[PDB]
Design a protein around this nucleic acid. Structure first.
Ligand SMILES: [Mg+2]
Ligand SMILES: [Mg+2]
Ligand SMILES: [Mg+2]
Ligand SMILES: [Mg+2]
Ligand SMILES: [Mg+2]
Ligand SMILES: [Mg+2]
Ligand SMILES: [Mg+2]
Ligand SMILES: [Mg+2]
Ligand SMILES: [Mg+2]
Ligand SMILES: [Mg+2]
Ligand SMILES: [Mg+2]
Ligand SMILES: [Mg+2]
Ligand SMILES: [Mg+2]
Ligand SMILES: [Mg+2]
Ligand SMILES: [Mg+2]
Ligand SMILES: [Mg+2]
Length: 49
RNA sequence: CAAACUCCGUGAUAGCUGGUUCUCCCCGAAAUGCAUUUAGGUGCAGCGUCGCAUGUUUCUUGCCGGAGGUAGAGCUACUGGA
């Protein structure tokens, strides 16, 4: 018997989103951008070497 | 006031400064080279990580084959110098 409550997503379909910057517990204070730098502020184009 | 004030383009633009919030488990860097209107930025390769693949090809020692050209030494051997 299938009720609307027993539905199960398949193992591995649901990968949790990565909420960058939410405490030193997981991703803290720099959001995986390292310390100061251009990538630390906005970005650099796809082109300029 | 070395270009008045209010509104608007306007979230002007900031390679600069600050800040970036709940827990645990696993691995774990560099401050190097090259290039750069580049030197406090950035990209490539090394350095980490995760996955896949080759599953030891890697490591240590012993022995073997090797080329050096340093320490030292030498100079009636040269270049110098006494
Ligand atoms: Mg900071
Ligand atoms: Mg720095
Ligand atoms: Mg950086
Ligand atoms: Mg006025
Ligand atoms: Mg407007
Ligand atoms: Mg505009
Ligand atoms: Mg602004
Ligand atoms: Mg900007
Ligand atoms: Mg500061
Ligand atoms: Mg460790
Ligand atoms: Mg083997
Ligand atoms: Mg030998
Ligand atoms: Mg020999
Ligand atoms: Mg000597
Ligand atoms: Mg002698
Ligand atoms: Mg001579």
């Amino acid at each position: 018997v299938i009720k609307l409550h027993d539905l199960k997503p398949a193992p591995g379909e649901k990968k949790a989103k990565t909420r960058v910057g939410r405490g030193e517990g997981s991703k803290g204070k720099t959001a995986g951008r390292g310390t100061k730098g251009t990538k630390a502020r906005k970005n650099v184009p796809v082109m300029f070497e």
